[PDB]
């Protein structure tokens, strides 16, 4: 990884000696029954992650943006349910949280939900961002349920004029999807298959035994996904219901688009970071439906989004190691005690 410099400085006597780390894999498949404990690991592995994920920098002044926002937003225009789209603030934070939170989730192979807020449509738009990237694969089926339908209904379908039959779902297999088979606008149509796929391409065996469910080069920094997520948006501007509606909605959409030049940057960021950090994980990691969630307020999400500039941050060298080191030890302990354990038990029998 070019960006990182390597060099040697001290020599080594033929006296040099170390002790094998011993990093056998799982040995114990807890992935298929000991839910209670996985939840506890995930949690752990998760916090661990946040501790690492670099804090962001150079953001757009909270005030400035939200202000051009009101100009664009046309907030108080009849609609009764005001001041629910602006509890967005504390972004100088929300983004940092939303950011960290997102990574660990992934790394730690955790699964979560969404402090969702139906009315606040914007908050939804951004949702579409989320699925555009984060492999829904690791999102308890349900929180995805709400999210999508909320999009699907209070959006697309009617403002796009299509199914004015809003949508009736009981419990098929992926409501977000199916929408595809019956949408007449390619742009819209690609989003659908890609999103309902991007299954977090769960297949990898690198640097010697490190199944770390990977992710699309595409996403990575081919990014386009974003460019396409936008282009599809660029032609959602039309009739059906009251005026203060399209006006408000589309205007918000545009804020995603313009910013899109930058939104790109986001993709790259994560792409790298996850793709980097990960490298130093010994513990394997099978995707599992944790028993516990993790609340992610579209609030923050939305912030991160239109609120990131030409910032650029990455894992401090020292930081990275520290990470390796830990998992390492831990492993060593697990494996070791295992041996210590077994040994006894077997003896215990004869």
């Amino acid at each position: 990884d070019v960006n990182y410099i390597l060099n040697m400085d001290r020599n080594l006597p033929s006296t040099a000696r170390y002790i094998r780390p011993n990093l056998l894999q799982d040995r114990l498949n807890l992935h298929d029954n000991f839910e209670s404990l996985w939840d506890t690991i995930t949690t752990s592995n998760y916090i661990l992650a946040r501790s690492v994920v670099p804090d962001l920098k150079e953001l757009v002044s909270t005030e400035a943006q939200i202000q051009k926002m009101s100009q664009d937003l046309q907030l108080e225009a009849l609609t009764i349910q005001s001041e629910t789209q602006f509890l967005t603030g504390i972004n100088s934070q929300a983004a940092n949280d939303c950011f960290k939170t997102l990574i660990a989730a992934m790394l730690s192979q955790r699964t979560m939900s969404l402090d969702f807020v139906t009315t606040n449509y914007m908050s939804l738009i951004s949702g579409m961002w989320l699925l555009t990237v984060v492999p829904n694969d690791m999102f308890i089926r349900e929180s995805l349920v709400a999210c999508q339908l909320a999009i699907v209904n209070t959006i697309i379908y009617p403002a796009f004029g299509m199914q004015r039959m809003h949508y009736r779902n009981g419990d098929p297999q992926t409501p977000f999807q199916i929408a595809e088979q019956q949408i007449q606008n390619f742009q819209v149509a690609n989003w659908l298959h890609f999103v309902n796929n991007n299954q977090f391409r769960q297949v990898v065996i690198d640097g010697v035994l490190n199944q770390v469910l990977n992710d699309n080069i595409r996403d990575g920094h081919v990014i386009n996904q974003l460019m396409e997520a936008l282009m599809q948006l660029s032609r959602q501007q039309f009739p059906t219901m009251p005026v203060d509606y399209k006006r408000s909605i589309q205007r918000g959409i545009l804020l995603l688009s313009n910013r899109l030049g930058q939104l790109v940057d986001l993709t790259r960021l994560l792409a790298y970071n996850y793709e980097t950090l990960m490298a130093c994980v010994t513990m394997n990691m099978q995707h599992v439906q944790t028993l516990t969630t993790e609340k992610l307020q579209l609030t923050s999400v939305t912030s991160l989004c239109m609120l990131i500039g030409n910032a650029t941050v990455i894992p401090s060298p020292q930081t990275l190691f520290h990470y390796y080191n830990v998992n390492v030890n831990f492993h060593s302990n697990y494996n070791e005690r295992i041996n210590d354990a077994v040994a006894i038990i077997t003896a215990a029998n004869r």
Partner: protein
Amino acid sequence: QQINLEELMRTGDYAQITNMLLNNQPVALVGALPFVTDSSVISLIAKLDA
């Protein structure tokens, strides 16, 4: 041969230079640079420049 300095301090130097210097091989460098004038011939015979 050559090696853009601008790209060097950018790239991070791959000991490419480090090696050549160590091993002594005819080479060149390029870009903005601080010159330094000397006189007392001596300096030269002594080959200070190396």
